[PDB]
PDB file of C-alpha atoms in Angstrom:
ATOM      1  CA  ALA H   1     -17.749-248.679 124.049  1.00  0.00           C
ATOM      2  CA  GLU H   2     -15.012-246.041 124.189  1.00  0.00           C
ATOM      3  CA  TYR H   3     -16.887-243.078 122.720  1.00  0.00           C
ATOM      4  CA  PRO H   4     -19.560-241.117 124.580  1.00  0.00           C
ATOM      5  CA  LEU H   5     -23.074-241.602 123.271  1.00  0.00           C
ATOM      6  CA  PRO H   6     -25.306-239.054 121.500  1.00  0.00           C
ATOM      7  CA  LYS H   7     -28.907-238.311 122.421  1.00  0.00           C
ATOM      8  CA  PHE H   8     -30.940-238.432 119.240  1.00  0.00           C
ATOM      9  CA  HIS H   9     -31.586-242.131 118.403  1.00  0.00           C
ATOM     10  CA  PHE H  10     -34.112-243.833 120.698  1.00  0.00           C
ATOM     11  CA  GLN H  11     -37.432-245.678 120.819  1.00  0.00           C
ATOM     12  CA  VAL H  12     -40.420-246.063 123.140  1.00  0.00           C
ATOM     13  CA  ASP H  13     -42.714-249.054 123.722  1.00  0.00           C
ATOM     14  CA  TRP H  14     -46.000-247.728 125.125  1.00  0.00           C
ATOM     15  CA  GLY H  15     -48.629-250.139 123.830  1.00  0.00           C
ATOM     16  CA  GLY H  16     -49.556-247.654 121.155  1.00  0.00           C
ATOM     17  CA  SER H  17     -50.062-248.205 117.426  1.00  0.00           C
ATOM     18  CA  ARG H  18     -47.430-245.833 115.991  1.00  0.00           C
ATOM     19  CA  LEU H  19     -43.903-244.769 116.938  1.00  0.00           C
ATOM     20  CA  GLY H  20     -41.559-241.858 116.252  1.00  0.00           C
ATOM     21  CA  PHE H  21     -41.502-239.512 119.236  1.00  0.00           C
ATOM     22  CA  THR H  22     -39.769-236.127 119.279  1.00  0.00           C
ATOM     23  CA  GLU H  23     -39.084-235.457 122.962  1.00  0.00           C
ATOM     24  CA  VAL H  24     -38.917-237.600 126.104  1.00  0.00           C
ATOM     25  CA  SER H  25     -38.097-235.986 129.447  1.00  0.00           C
ATOM     26  CA  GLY H  26     -38.549-236.592 133.161  1.00  0.00           C
ATOM     27  CA  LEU H  27     -36.357-239.559 134.161  1.00  0.00           C
ATOM     28  CA  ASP H  28     -35.317-239.000 137.795  1.00  0.00           C
ATOM     29  CA  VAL H  29     -35.156-240.696 141.214  1.00  0.00           C
ATOM     30  CA  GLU H  30     -34.815-239.182 144.681  1.00  0.00           C
ATOM     31  CA  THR H  31     -34.671-239.881 148.436  1.00  0.00           C
ATOM     32  CA  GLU H  32     -35.505-237.450 151.263  1.00  0.00           C
ATOM     33  CA  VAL H  33     -32.974-236.454 153.959  1.00  0.00           C
ATOM     34  CA  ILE H  34     -33.761-236.676 157.681  1.00  0.00           C
ATOM     35  CA  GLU H  35     -31.702-234.581 160.099  1.00  0.00           C
ATOM     36  CA  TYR H  36     -30.873-235.065 163.764  1.00  0.00           C
ATOM     37  CA  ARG H  37     -28.756-233.517 166.520  1.00  0.00           C
ATOM     38  CA  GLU H  38     -28.565-233.927 170.299  1.00  0.00           C
ATOM     39  CA  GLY H  39     -27.476-231.232 172.705  1.00  0.00           C
ATOM     40  CA  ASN H  40     -24.069-232.544 173.767  1.00  0.00           C
ATOM     41  CA  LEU H  41     -22.566-233.260 170.357  1.00  0.00           C
ATOM     42  CA  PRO H  42     -19.203-231.466 169.899  1.00  0.00           C
ATOM     43  CA  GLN H  43     -20.062-230.466 166.324  1.00  0.00           C
ATOM     44  CA  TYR H  44     -22.626-227.718 165.819  1.00  0.00           C
ATOM     45  CA  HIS H  45     -24.223-229.086 162.647  1.00  0.00           C
ATOM     46  CA  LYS H  46     -26.613-231.956 162.065  1.00  0.00           C
ATOM     47  CA  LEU H  47     -26.439-235.625 161.091  1.00  0.00           C
ATOM     48  CA  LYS H  48     -28.232-236.894 157.987  1.00  0.00           C
ATOM     49  CA  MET H  49     -29.850-240.200 157.047  1.00  0.00           C
ATOM     50  CA  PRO H  50     -32.065-241.525 154.228  1.00  0.00           C
ATOM     51  CA  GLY H  51     -35.860-241.337 154.160  1.00  0.00           C
ATOM     52  CA  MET H  52     -38.607-241.989 151.611  1.00  0.00           C
ATOM     53  CA  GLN H  53     -38.370-242.154 147.814  1.00  0.00           C
ATOM     54  CA  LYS H  54     -39.876-239.912 145.142  1.00  0.00           C
ATOM     55  CA  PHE H  55     -40.470-240.312 141.399  1.00  0.00           C
ATOM     56  CA  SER H  56     -41.388-237.782 138.723  1.00  0.00           C
ATOM     57  CA  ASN H  57     -43.943-237.653 135.940  1.00  0.00           C
ATOM     58  CA  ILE H  58     -42.788-238.300 132.379  1.00  0.00           C
ATOM     59  CA  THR H  59     -43.514-236.067 129.381  1.00  0.00           C
ATOM     60  CA  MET H  60     -43.539-237.104 125.722  1.00  0.00           C
ATOM     61  CA  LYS H  61     -44.020-235.031 122.575  1.00  0.00           C
ATOM     62  CA  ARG H  62     -44.779-236.124 119.026  1.00  0.00           C
ATOM     63  CA  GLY H  63     -46.095-234.801 115.726  1.00  0.00           C
ATOM     64  CA  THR H  64     -49.675-235.045 114.495  1.00  0.00           C
ATOM     65  CA  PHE H  65     -50.779-237.330 111.656  1.00  0.00           C
ATOM     66  CA  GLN H  66     -54.092-237.949 109.935  1.00  0.00           C
ATOM     67  CA  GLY H  67     -55.921-240.960 111.347  1.00  0.00           C
ATOM     68  CA  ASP H  68     -53.927-241.278 114.591  1.00  0.00           C
ATOM     69  CA  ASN H  69     -55.885-240.569 117.780  1.00  0.00           C
ATOM     70  CA  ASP H  70     -53.979-242.719 120.277  1.00  0.00           C
ATOM     71  CA  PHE H  71     -53.168-240.292 123.101  1.00  0.00           C
ATOM     72  CA  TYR H  72     -56.852-239.471 123.472  1.00  0.00           C
ATOM     73  CA  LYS H  73     -57.733-243.157 123.166  1.00  0.00           C
ATOM     74  CA  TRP H  74     -55.559-244.067 126.147  1.00  0.00           C
ATOM     75  CA  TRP H  75     -56.616-241.067 128.248  1.00  0.00           C
ATOM     76  CA  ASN H  76     -60.320-241.742 127.616  1.00  0.00           C
ATOM     77  CA  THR H  77     -60.306-245.228 129.186  1.00  0.00           C
ATOM     78  CA  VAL H  78     -60.866-243.714 132.631  1.00  0.00           C
ATOM     79  CA  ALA H  79     -63.782-244.709 134.859  1.00  0.00           C
ATOM     80  CA  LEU H  80     -64.347-243.323 138.382  1.00  0.00           C
ATOM     81  CA  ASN H  81     -61.047-244.569 139.884  1.00  0.00           C
ATOM     82  CA  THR H  82     -60.151-247.300 137.379  1.00  0.00           C
ATOM     83  CA  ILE H  83     -58.018-246.963 134.252  1.00  0.00           C
ATOM     84  CA  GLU H  84     -55.919-249.107 131.913  1.00  0.00           C
ATOM     85  CA  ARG H  85     -52.318-249.286 133.144  1.00  0.00           C
ATOM     86  CA  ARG H  86     -49.405-250.282 130.915  1.00  0.00           C
ATOM     87  CA  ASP H  87     -45.738-251.231 131.199  1.00  0.00           C
ATOM     88  CA  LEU H  88     -43.464-248.661 129.567  1.00  0.00           C
ATOM     89  CA  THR H  89     -40.066-249.310 128.011  1.00  0.00           C
ATOM     90  CA  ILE H  90     -37.637-246.662 126.739  1.00  0.00           C
ATOM     91  CA  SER H  91     -34.407-247.597 124.982  1.00  0.00           C
ATOM     92  CA  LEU H  92     -31.440-245.655 123.607  1.00  0.00           C
ATOM     93  CA  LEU H  93     -29.881-247.070 120.459  1.00  0.00           C
ATOM     94  CA  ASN H  94     -26.445-246.748 119.003  1.00  0.00           C
ATOM     95  CA  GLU H  95     -25.216-246.621 115.374  1.00  0.00           C
ATOM     96  CA  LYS H  96     -25.956-250.348 114.830  1.00  0.00           C
ATOM     97  CA  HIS H  97     -29.374-250.021 116.479  1.00  0.00           C
ATOM     98  CA  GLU H  98     -28.570-252.107 119.564  1.00  0.00           C
ATOM     99  CA  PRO H  99     -30.363-251.238 122.828  1.00  0.00           C
ATOM    100  CA  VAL H 100     -27.726-249.848 125.171  1.00  0.00           C
ATOM    101  CA  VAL H 101     -29.552-248.056 127.993  1.00  0.00           C
ATOM    102  CA  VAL H 102     -33.036-249.161 129.027  1.00  0.00           C
ATOM    103  CA  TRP H 103     -35.525-247.438 131.325  1.00  0.00           C
ATOM    104  CA  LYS H 104     -38.351-249.626 132.647  1.00  0.00           C
ATOM    105  CA  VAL H 105     -41.429-247.872 134.014  1.00  0.00           C
ATOM    106  CA  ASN H 106     -44.031-249.580 136.197  1.00  0.00           C
ATOM    107  CA  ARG H 107     -47.805-249.021 136.136  1.00  0.00           C
ATOM    108  CA  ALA H 108     -48.112-245.920 133.939  1.00  0.00           C
ATOM    109  CA  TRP H 109     -51.392-244.167 133.101  1.00  0.00           C
ATOM    110  CA  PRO H 110     -51.844-240.835 131.275  1.00  0.00           C
ATOM    111  CA  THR H 111     -52.643-237.862 133.483  1.00  0.00           C
ATOM    112  CA  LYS H 112     -52.638-235.098 130.870  1.00  0.00           C
ATOM    113  CA  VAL H 113     -52.985-234.569 127.112  1.00  0.00           C
ATOM    114  CA  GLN H 114     -52.287-231.265 125.348  1.00  0.00           C
ATOM    115  CA  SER H 115     -53.021-230.520 121.697  1.00  0.00           C
ATOM    116  CA  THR H 116     -51.410-227.968 119.430  1.00  0.00           C
ATOM    117  CA  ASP H 117     -52.189-224.266 119.149  1.00  0.00           C
ATOM    118  CA  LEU H 118     -53.324-222.674 115.892  1.00  0.00           C
ATOM    119  CA  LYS H 119     -51.588-219.627 114.406  1.00  0.00           C
ATOM    120  CA  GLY H 120     -52.487-217.973 111.125  1.00  0.00           C
ATOM    121  CA  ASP H 121     -48.815-217.018 110.728  1.00  0.00           C
ATOM    122  CA  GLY H 122     -47.144-220.161 112.080  1.00  0.00           C
ATOM    123  CA  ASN H 123     -44.743-221.948 109.740  1.00  0.00           C
ATOM    124  CA  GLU H 124     -44.340-224.971 111.969  1.00  0.00           C
ATOM    125  CA  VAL H 125     -45.601-228.516 112.344  1.00  0.00           C
ATOM    126  CA  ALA H 126     -48.359-229.291 114.829  1.00  0.00           C
ATOM    127  CA  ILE H 127     -47.139-231.093 117.954  1.00  0.00           C
ATOM    128  CA  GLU H 128     -49.009-232.809 120.793  1.00  0.00           C
ATOM    129  CA  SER H 129     -47.905-233.819 124.273  1.00  0.00           C
ATOM    130  CA  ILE H 130     -48.756-236.394 126.929  1.00  0.00           C
ATOM    131  CA  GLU H 131     -47.895-236.499 130.638  1.00  0.00           C
ATOM    132  CA  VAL H 132     -47.790-239.830 132.471  1.00  0.00           C
ATOM    133  CA  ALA H 133     -47.715-240.966 136.111  1.00  0.00           C
ATOM    134  CA  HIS H 134     -46.234-244.269 137.254  1.00  0.00           C
ATOM    135  CA  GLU H 135     -45.286-246.328 140.305  1.00  0.00           C
ATOM    136  CA  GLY H 136     -41.679-247.229 139.600  1.00  0.00           C
ATOM    137  CA  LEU H 137     -38.585-246.781 137.471  1.00  0.00           C
ATOM    138  CA  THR H 138     -35.458-248.860 136.855  1.00  0.00           C
ATOM    139  CA  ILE H 139     -32.253-248.226 134.867  1.00  0.00           C
ATOM    140  CA  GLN H 140     -30.274-250.908 133.017  1.00  0.00           C
ATOM    141  CA  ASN H 141     -26.929-250.129 131.361  1.00  0.00           C
ATOM    142  CA  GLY H 142     -24.648-252.888 130.124  1.00  0.00           C
TER     143      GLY H 142
ATOM    144  CA  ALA T   1     -43.804-180.393 169.011  1.00  0.00           C
ATOM    145  CA  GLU T   2     -45.340-182.500 166.274  1.00  0.00           C
ATOM    146  CA  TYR T   3     -43.461-185.742 166.607  1.00  0.00           C
ATOM    147  CA  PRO T   4     -43.890-188.357 169.319  1.00  0.00           C
ATOM    148  CA  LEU T   5     -41.263-190.594 171.001  1.00  0.00           C
ATOM    149  CA  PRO T   6     -39.992-194.095 170.097  1.00  0.00           C
ATOM    150  CA  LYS T   7     -40.028-197.145 172.383  1.00  0.00           C
ATOM    151  CA  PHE T   8     -36.524-198.627 172.257  1.00  0.00           C
ATOM    152  CA  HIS T   9     -34.172-196.501 174.437  1.00  0.00           C
ATOM    153  CA  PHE T  10     -34.733-196.906 178.187  1.00  0.00           C
ATOM    154  CA  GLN T  11     -33.101-197.905 181.471  1.00  0.00           C
ATOM    155  CA  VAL T  12     -34.047-199.566 184.758  1.00  0.00           C
ATOM    156  CA  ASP T  13     -32.692-199.005 188.279  1.00  0.00           C
ATOM    157  CA  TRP T  14     -33.405-202.154 190.303  1.00  0.00           C
ATOM    158  CA  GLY T  15     -30.441-202.716 192.622  1.00  0.00           C
ATOM    159  CA  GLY T  16     -28.481-205.105 190.438  1.00  0.00           C
ATOM    160  CA  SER T  17     -25.323-204.439 188.413  1.00  0.00           C
ATOM    161  CA  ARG T  18     -26.542-204.490 184.768  1.00  0.00           C
ATOM    162  CA  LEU T  19     -28.794-201.698 183.488  1.00  0.00           C
ATOM    163  CA  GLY T  20     -29.967-203.075 180.155  1.00  0.00           C
ATOM    164  CA  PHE T  21     -33.052-205.149 179.449  1.00  0.00           C
ATOM    165  CA  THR T  22     -34.789-206.379 176.386  1.00  0.00           C
ATOM    166  CA  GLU T  23     -38.386-206.194 177.576  1.00  0.00           C
ATOM    167  CA  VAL T  24     -40.344-204.345 180.266  1.00  0.00           C
ATOM    168  CA  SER T  25     -44.126-204.699 180.425  1.00  0.00           C
ATOM    169  CA  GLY T  26     -46.983-204.339 182.890  1.00  0.00           C
ATOM    170  CA  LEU T  27     -47.391-200.628 183.710  1.00  0.00           C
ATOM    171  CA  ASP T  28     -51.087-200.060 184.489  1.00  0.00           C
ATOM    172  CA  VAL T  29     -53.457-198.514 187.055  1.00  0.00           C
ATOM    173  CA  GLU T  30     -57.160-199.124 187.641  1.00  0.00           C
ATOM    174  CA  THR T  31     -60.202-198.278 189.795  1.00  0.00           C
ATOM    175  CA  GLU T  32     -63.336-200.400 190.177  1.00  0.00           C
ATOM    176  CA  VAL T  33     -66.848-199.166 189.391  1.00  0.00           C
ATOM    177  CA  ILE T  34     -69.756-199.313 191.849  1.00  0.00           C
ATOM    178  CA  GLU T  35     -73.302-199.204 190.475  1.00  0.00           C
ATOM    179  CA  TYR T  36     -76.559-198.039 192.018  1.00  0.00           C
ATOM    180  CA  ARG T  37     -80.206-197.478 191.092  1.00  0.00           C
ATOM    181  CA  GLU T  38     -83.394-196.803 193.058  1.00  0.00           C
ATOM    182  CA  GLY T  39     -86.861-197.801 191.950  1.00  0.00           C
ATOM    183  CA  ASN T  40     -88.334-194.413 191.046  1.00  0.00           C
ATOM    184  CA  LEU T  41     -85.558-193.079 188.829  1.00  0.00           C
ATOM    185  CA  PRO T  42     -86.890-192.035 185.385  1.00  0.00           C
ATOM    186  CA  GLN T  43     -83.900-193.582 183.601  1.00  0.00           C
ATOM    187  CA  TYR T  44     -83.724-197.365 183.390  1.00  0.00           C
ATOM    188  CA  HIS T  45     -79.945-197.716 183.672  1.00  0.00           C
ATOM    189  CA  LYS T  46     -77.595-197.384 186.615  1.00  0.00           C
ATOM    190  CA  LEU T  47     -75.391-194.715 188.182  1.00  0.00           C
ATOM    191  CA  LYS T  48     -71.648-195.270 188.565  1.00  0.00           C
ATOM    192  CA  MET T  49     -69.060-194.111 191.090  1.00  0.00           C
ATOM    193  CA  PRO T  50     -65.413-194.902 191.917  1.00  0.00           C
ATOM    194  CA  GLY T  51     -64.252-197.695 194.219  1.00  0.00           C
ATOM    195  CA  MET T  52     -60.932-199.321 195.125  1.00  0.00           C
ATOM    196  CA  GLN T  53     -57.641-199.286 193.211  1.00  0.00           C
ATOM    197  CA  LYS T  54     -55.715-202.113 191.557  1.00  0.00           C
ATOM    198  CA  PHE T  55     -52.136-202.453 190.295  1.00  0.00           C
ATOM    199  CA  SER T  56     -50.484-205.110 188.139  1.00  0.00           C
ATOM    200  CA  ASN T  57     -47.322-207.172 188.348  1.00  0.00           C
ATOM    201  CA  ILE T  58     -44.334-206.139 186.242  1.00  0.00           C
ATOM    202  CA  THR T  59     -42.361-208.434 183.930  1.00  0.00           C
ATOM    203  CA  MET T  60     -38.773-207.955 182.766  1.00  0.00           C
ATOM    204  CA  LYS T  61     -36.684-209.973 180.317  1.00  0.00           C
ATOM    205  CA  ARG T  62     -32.943-209.965 179.711  1.00  0.00           C
ATOM    206  CA  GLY T  63     -30.174-212.041 178.170  1.00  0.00           C
ATOM    207  CA  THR T  64     -27.902-214.451 180.016  1.00  0.00           C
ATOM    208  CA  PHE T  65     -24.241-213.783 180.735  1.00  0.00           C
ATOM    209  CA  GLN T  66     -21.453-215.774 182.339  1.00  0.00           C
ATOM    210  CA  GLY T  67     -20.957-214.818 185.978  1.00  0.00           C
ATOM    211  CA  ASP T  68     -24.273-212.983 186.466  1.00  0.00           C
ATOM    212  CA  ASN T  69     -26.712-214.647 188.872  1.00  0.00           C
ATOM    213  CA  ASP T  70     -28.647-211.619 190.129  1.00  0.00           C
ATOM    214  CA  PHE T  71     -32.287-212.592 189.562  1.00  0.00           C
ATOM    215  CA  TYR T  72     -31.784-215.728 191.635  1.00  0.00           C
ATOM    216  CA  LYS T  73     -29.829-213.740 194.219  1.00  0.00           C
ATOM    217  CA  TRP T  74     -32.744-211.375 194.811  1.00  0.00           C
ATOM    218  CA  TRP T  75     -35.398-214.111 194.759  1.00  0.00           C
ATOM    219  CA  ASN T  76     -33.442-216.263 197.232  1.00  0.00           C
ATOM    220  CA  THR T  77     -33.472-213.669 200.039  1.00  0.00           C
ATOM    221  CA  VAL T  78     -36.876-214.910 201.197  1.00  0.00           C
ATOM    222  CA  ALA T  79     -37.528-216.095 204.751  1.00  0.00           C
ATOM    223  CA  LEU T  80     -40.951-217.243 206.023  1.00  0.00           C
ATOM    224  CA  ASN T  81     -42.799-213.950 205.364  1.00  0.00           C
ATOM    225  CA  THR T  82     -39.847-211.544 205.166  1.00  0.00           C
ATOM    226  CA  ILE T  83     -37.917-210.499 202.065  1.00  0.00           C
ATOM    227  CA  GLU T  84     -35.708-207.660 200.827  1.00  0.00           C
ATOM    228  CA  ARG T  85     -37.823-204.933 199.213  1.00  0.00           C
ATOM    229  CA  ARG T  86     -36.404-202.334 196.831  1.00  0.00           C
ATOM    230  CA  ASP T  87     -37.421-199.075 195.164  1.00  0.00           C
ATOM    231  CA  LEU T  88     -37.694-199.423 191.390  1.00  0.00           C
ATOM    232  CA  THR T  89     -37.143-196.686 188.822  1.00  0.00           C
ATOM    233  CA  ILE T  90     -37.806-196.958 185.079  1.00  0.00           C
ATOM    234  CA  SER T  91     -36.918-194.150 182.685  1.00  0.00           C
ATOM    235  CA  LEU T  92     -37.388-193.547 178.961  1.00  0.00           C
ATOM    236  CA  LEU T  93     -34.303-191.816 177.603  1.00  0.00           C
ATOM    237  CA  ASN T  94     -33.676-189.153 174.956  1.00  0.00           C
ATOM    238  CA  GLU T  95     -30.901-188.186 172.513  1.00  0.00           C
ATOM    239  CA  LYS T  96     -28.913-186.473 175.290  1.00  0.00           C
ATOM    240  CA  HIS T  97     -29.021-189.647 177.374  1.00  0.00           C
ATOM    241  CA  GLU T  98     -31.486-188.104 179.799  1.00  0.00           C
ATOM    242  CA  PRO T  99     -34.913-189.023 181.140  1.00  0.00           C
ATOM    243  CA  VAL T 100     -38.283-187.862 179.796  1.00  0.00           C
ATOM    244  CA  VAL T 101     -40.864-190.229 181.300  1.00  0.00           C
ATOM    245  CA  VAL T 102     -40.259-191.810 184.701  1.00  0.00           C
ATOM    246  CA  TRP T 103     -42.150-194.626 186.417  1.00  0.00           C
ATOM    247  CA  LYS T 104     -41.584-194.957 190.170  1.00  0.00           C
ATOM    248  CA  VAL T 105     -42.493-198.314 191.708  1.00  0.00           C
ATOM    249  CA  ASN T 106     -42.860-198.677 195.470  1.00  0.00           C
ATOM    250  CA  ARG T 107     -42.099-201.758 197.580  1.00  0.00           C
ATOM    251  CA  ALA T 108     -41.124-204.328 194.980  1.00  0.00           C
ATOM    252  CA  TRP T 109     -40.043-207.932 195.587  1.00  0.00           C
ATOM    253  CA  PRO T 110     -39.597-210.741 193.027  1.00  0.00           C
ATOM    254  CA  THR T 111     -42.413-213.270 192.875  1.00  0.00           C
ATOM    255  CA  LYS T 112     -41.207-215.405 189.969  1.00  0.00           C
ATOM    256  CA  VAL T 113     -38.033-216.272 188.043  1.00  0.00           C
ATOM    257  CA  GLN T 114     -37.987-218.253 184.789  1.00  0.00           C
ATOM    258  CA  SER T 115     -34.871-219.537 183.037  1.00  0.00           C
ATOM    259  CA  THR T 116     -34.380-220.377 179.390  1.00  0.00           C
ATOM    260  CA  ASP T 117     -35.317-223.576 177.579  1.00  0.00           C
ATOM    261  CA  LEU T 118     -32.746-225.717 175.783  1.00  0.00           C
ATOM    262  CA  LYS T 119     -33.163-226.771 172.146  1.00  0.00           C
ATOM    263  CA  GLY T 120     -30.668-228.793 170.148  1.00  0.00           C
ATOM    264  CA  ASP T 121     -31.827-226.930 167.026  1.00  0.00           C
ATOM    265  CA  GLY T 122     -32.310-223.436 168.458  1.00  0.00           C
ATOM    266  CA  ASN T 123     -30.331-220.639 166.816  1.00  0.00           C
ATOM    267  CA  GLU T 124     -31.233-218.062 169.426  1.00  0.00           C
ATOM    268  CA  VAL T 125     -29.805-216.392 172.503  1.00  0.00           C
ATOM    269  CA  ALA T 126     -30.813-217.605 175.951  1.00  0.00           C
ATOM    270  CA  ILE T 127     -33.215-215.264 177.754  1.00  0.00           C
ATOM    271  CA  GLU T 128     -34.445-215.162 181.355  1.00  0.00           C
ATOM    272  CA  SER T 129     -37.424-213.442 182.941  1.00  0.00           C
ATOM    273  CA  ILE T 130     -38.480-212.029 186.301  1.00  0.00           C
ATOM    274  CA  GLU T 131     -41.932-211.107 187.623  1.00  0.00           C
ATOM    275  CA  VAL T 132     -42.278-208.541 190.408  1.00  0.00           C
ATOM    276  CA  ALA T 133     -45.029-207.441 192.810  1.00  0.00           C
ATOM    277  CA  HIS T 134     -45.211-203.979 194.356  1.00  0.00           C
ATOM    278  CA  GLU T 135     -47.365-201.648 196.448  1.00  0.00           C
ATOM    279  CA  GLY T 136     -47.523-198.532 194.307  1.00  0.00           C
ATOM    280  CA  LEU T 137     -46.801-196.827 191.009  1.00  0.00           C
ATOM    281  CA  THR T 138     -46.433-193.201 189.915  1.00  0.00           C
ATOM    282  CA  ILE T 139     -45.940-191.543 186.504  1.00  0.00           C
ATOM    283  CA  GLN T 140     -43.911-188.372 185.899  1.00  0.00           C
ATOM    284  CA  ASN T 141     -43.806-186.696 182.475  1.00  0.00           C
ATOM    285  CA  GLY T 142     -42.375-183.219 182.022  1.00  0.00           C
TER     286      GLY T 142
END
């Protein structure tokens, strides 16, 4: 309550079987600026007012396990213009595992899935990524 | 020699005070073609010979200054079918501030004057234009 929070203890509800994600990025909101000026205004710069909103895609990365094929499962539910949409919840936890900051996403479906690359000299774990589109985002703190 | 001349150092004598313009275009001469063929000619295309002459109107553009109302002054000297006609001289200058190519224009009077347009978002100088009719043109080089 008095200390600033760290950024390494979180969880994601995505209607998937397993949990334990490595990276989650892309949480933004924006509004466009509209500008205006008429000829007789004594200042020689413009006036500004709000416009339309814009939201970003969300990226998630996790490690690969035997028997788990969930990213592909969700991506592959796509017909011509129909797909299975889900509600997404992201929460940041503190030392006593209590949800402190919550991000609520609306109508999210997977737009991209990327698998790992194979290197004969690579001493690292295999990681996979998913990219998701949505129609809304909301922040709740305290 | 082996090098030609550039196109950005010139002057205009027109009867007004200022002697600097930003654009001068319209310097042309032409003759019509007359065609002829009789029935028994062994070639099946026509013969060509010179006809009447034709000259073009001349356009000049310059920037706007406080206190200078000369284009309008010249245009506004028009009675029913009488107007003040002037001799026009255009010269392309050299390094020694002298003339190399001279265009002499005979019996010129202004047929059109256009002022600038006003834009609340325009970051440019205001420019005005004049269009002139004449009864002759002559070129002198060297």
